[PDB]
Design a protein around this ligand. Structure first.
Ligand SMILES: CN1CCCc2cc(CN)ccc21
Ligand SMILES: [Mn+2]
Ligand SMILES: [Mn+2]
Lengths: 137, 137
């Protein structure tokens, strides 16, 4: 039986700029780097960057809604989002609201998000302002 | 600062087969569903399925190496892999590393993995037998 996420692996087109993005800009911990990959952590998350010549830099209008959200506290959210905008990080748009979030792209067009709040808080907010057709189990 | 992964959102082409896969086949807990999505949990992982008309059922040869690995114990690994094989789930890669991994596809072609072992265990193995160009920090 499954117990959670073991690791997230992102395919990247150029290793050095991607390591710089996740380590220098987002502040993840770099544990190891080799000619074709890197291992980073963010709290409990094991992130692997894997050099892949198949990876294409895709505009957000032509990629689907698959995306990866990172937790940040209420106190740090705005100042962290402001730092990303000042660094010229591009944005993308989701079709629906899901609370306090900032949506941004990595150098290869992976869709990232900063989000404040847990699943439990999201469900409680949705009880008051449900999505269309929502049912709770 | 970022404190971990908040949620993983997968774009899906049809909600019902994706809920069946993640809830019934993989055993994740379904918390809520609406006209265009669902929220599930797997241990401490919050998973969102988002219905997206942009999502193509993508063959594994046409997508890059980006993938999502779930944690499982060694004791449960072989029986879980056998369950996936009985259900007809396609495999996209053979395991060619030491640790136990099973590489399988979801109904829309998202690349998934079952993996036994932590980052610390991988780093220890790599310290003994480093990859080409490997530097530790
Ligand atoms: C940390 N550092 C900066 C200079 C380029 C570079 C390359 C590798 C892979 N051979 C590992 C570390 C590193
Ligand atoms: Mn999100
Ligand atoms: Mn993997």
């Amino acid at each position: 039986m499954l117990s959670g996420l073991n690791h997230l692996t992102l395919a990247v087109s150029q290793l050095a700029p991607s390591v710089a993005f996740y380590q220098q800009l987002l502040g993840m911990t770099l544990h190891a780097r080799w000619d074709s990959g890197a291992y980073l952590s963010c709290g409990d998350l094991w992130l692997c960057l894997s050099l892949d010549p198949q990876r294409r830099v895709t505009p957000p209008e032509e990629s689907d809604y698959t995306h990866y959200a990172f937790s940040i506290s209420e106190a740090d959210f705005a100042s962290f989002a402001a730092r990303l905008e000042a660094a010229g990080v591009a944005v993308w748009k989701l079709n629906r609201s899901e609370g306090a979030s900032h949506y941004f792209l990595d150098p290869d067009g992976h869709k990232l998000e900063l989000h404040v709040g847990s699943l439990a808080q999201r469900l409680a907010a949705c009880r008051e302002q449900p999505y269309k057709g929502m049912v709770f189990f």
